[PDB]
Each structure stands twice: as structure tokens, then as C-alpha cells.
Write a protein that binds this ligand. Structure first.
Ligand SMILES: Nc1ncnc2c1ncn2[C@@H]1O[C@H](COP(=O)(O)OP(=O)(O)O)[C@@H](O)[C@H]1O
Ligand SMILES: [NH3+]Cc1cc(-c2ccccc2)no1
Ligand code: NA
Length: 266
């Protein structure tokens, strides 16, 4: 289905630098059109996100569309395999749905015939102007096998690193996930951030989801019993129990590889 996503910047913990860069990348064409006319700037057509899984690349693509009040179309890389006109029809539908964000997920899978489902993608991008109001976003978990042809000017304009959350970011992710939940006052999220070094954003969300379930199942059972004869909260002890099916999903070795890739691009 095609729709404007509900996720906002507020749902995304950390990545504050990345967020104002993306805002500037899309707010500037419509907030200062006179200066965009004055100097000859063409709006950006695309970005490529990279980093470990579960750290917010999909969330950021949906928040960009929500900011622009734009439709969102998602395509996972493995599913363009049956048929090179598959690529042509997706760009048609995105153009039909303009203004629109077109998100290519799991692009590392086609980075490994398939040789130019790629060329088709590259040609569709070259043949589409910024006047069509379609903004393209790709995401990958394997930045080592990016064909640099997709980063040439006129295609995806910027490669952007989306890293594992640091300690400050882990507090923000917990707070964003819990922003509309009733959390007991004995819950110390800064201490939970201290104890989750190396956790991804998806890893943190599971802890919150397990603690919230445990609370619901407590609420269910206690009213079942009080029947035999006041909004409840997620308490510290629900979080205590959730945290021992809690472990990192990204290895220390993959973390080293991402950090090396990113640090060498300064
Ligand atoms: N920065 C973040 N802030 C808040 N939640 C996050 C963040 N990163 C990941 N999550 C949680 O993990 C889930 C997966 O994130 P996603 O953006 O799909 O990861 P990927 O980087 O693999 O695209 C999200 O739905 C959300 O619950
Ligand atoms: N097993 C997953 C995996 C990840 C990587 C990798 C390679 C380069 C940079 C970052 C990550 N190589 O393999
Ligand atoms: Na990923």
C-alpha cells in the first residue's frame, strides 16, 4: 500500500546530525526558493544509508516522507528476482504517486543477470529529473561491496553512516520508544543505557516490548483474581525480567568492520 508514513523525527533516538542534514536536504528547496533560484541549485535526488542492522535506516526514510507529506513506497532487494522491466514499473508507480519517497531496502543482497537490474536502476535514475518530485533512498548493511557507479553526481548524492547508538543515543532510543507508554518512576533508563553497550536500536526496542507484555499479562491476571473478591505502569521489575533474554545481535567483529569503513572516509 502507498501512504504518508506516521513515523516522525521524534520517534528516532540519536542521529541528530543526520536528521538536520536530511531536513536541510529537503526543507531548503521549499523554505528558500528565491535563493535556490538565485544561485542555480538543483534539489538532491537520492541518499544511500549504510551501517549495522536495526539502527534506524528504514525509520529515517519514513520520517523524510512524513516531513514532506509524501507517499512512501518500499521495495526489498531480494524480491526483484523472477524481468528487467520490473525496475521500470516501480519507477512508474513512484512517479504516479508523486510527491513520493522510493526506498530500496536490502541492496547488499543484489550486490551479491542481476548484473543489471542494477543498470536498469541506474538508467531509471538518470532518466528522471528532480522536477518529478521523487526522492530515492537506498540502504545496505554491506558498504564494502557498493558499486560506486550509484554514487555518481545525479544519482544518490550522499553516502551517510548510521552507526550503533552510543550511550547518549541509547537513552534517547528508550525514551522515544516509551514516549507514549506509562512507565513507573522507579525506572532508570540511564542505567539501562549503561548496561547495554553494543546493543542496536532494534535490540533496545525488544527490551521495551518484553517489559510491556509482562505488565499487560500481570494486569490481566490480577483483575482475573480480584474478580473473585487507575492505569497500571511498566515497573522496574518488568524491565528486570525482560533483560535476561537480551543480548546484542551484532558481533564485535562486524562492529570493527563498520567503524573501519566509516573512519577511513573520515
Ligand atoms: N534510532 C532509533 N530510534 C528508535 N528506534 C529504533 C532506532 N533504530 C532502530 N529502532 C527500532 O528498531 C526497529 C528497526 O529499525 P530499522 O530502521 O528498520 O533498522 P535498519 O537500520 O535495519 O533499517 C525500529 O522499528 C525501531 O523499533
Ligand atoms: N557477517 C556480516 C558481515 C558484515 C561485513 C562487513 C564488511 C565490511 C564493513 C562492514 C561489515 N562483512 O560481513
Ligand atoms: Na540493516
Amino acid at each position: 500500500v502507498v501512504e504518508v508514513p506516521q513515523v516522525t523525527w521524534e520517534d528516532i533516538g540519536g542521529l541528530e546530525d543526520v536528521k538536520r542534514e536530511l531536513q536541510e536536504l529537503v526543507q531548503y528547496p521549499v523554505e528558500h526558493p528565491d535563493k535556490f533560484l538565485k544561485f542555480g541549485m538543483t534539489p538532491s535526488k537520492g541518499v544511500l544509508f549504510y551501517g549495522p542492522p536495526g539502527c534506524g535506516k528504514t525509520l529515517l526514510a519514513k520520517a523524510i516522507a512524513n516531513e514532506c507529506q509524501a507517499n512512501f513506497i518500499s521495495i526489498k532487494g531480494p524480491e526483484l528476482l523472477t524481468s528487467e522491466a520490473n525496475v521500470r514499473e516501480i519507477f512508474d508507480k513512484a512517479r504516479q504517486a508523486a510527491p513520493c519517497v522510493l526506498f530500496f531496502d536490502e541492496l547488499d543482497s543484489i550486490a551479491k543477470a542481476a548484473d543489471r537490474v542494477i543498470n536498469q536502476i541506474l538508467t531509471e535514475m538518470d532518466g528522471m529529473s528532480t522536477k518529478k518530485n521523487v526522492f530515492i533512498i537506498g540502504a545496505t548493511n554491506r558498504p564494502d561491496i557498493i558499486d560506486p557507479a550509484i554514487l555518481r553526481p545525479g544519482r544518490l548524492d550522499q553516502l551517510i553512516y548510521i552507526p550503533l547508538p552510543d550511550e547518549k543515543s541509547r537513552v534517547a532510543i528508550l525514551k522515544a520508544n516509551l514516549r507514549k507508554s506509562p512507565v513507573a518512576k522507579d525506572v532508570d533508563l540511564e542505567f539501562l543505557a549503561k548496561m547495554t553497550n553494543g546493543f542496536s536500536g532494534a535490540d533496545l526496542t525488544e527490551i521495551c516490548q518484553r517489559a510491556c507484555k509482562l505488565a499487560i499479562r500481570e494486569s490481566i491476571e490480577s483483575e482475573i483474581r480480584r474478580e473473585r473478591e487507575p492505569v497500571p505502569e511498566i515497573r522496574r521489575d518488568h524491565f528486570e525480567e525482560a533483560m535476561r533474554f537480551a543480548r546484542r545481535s551484532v558481533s564485535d567483529n562486524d562492529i570493527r568492520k563498520y567503524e573501519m569503513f566509516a573512519q577511513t572516509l573520515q
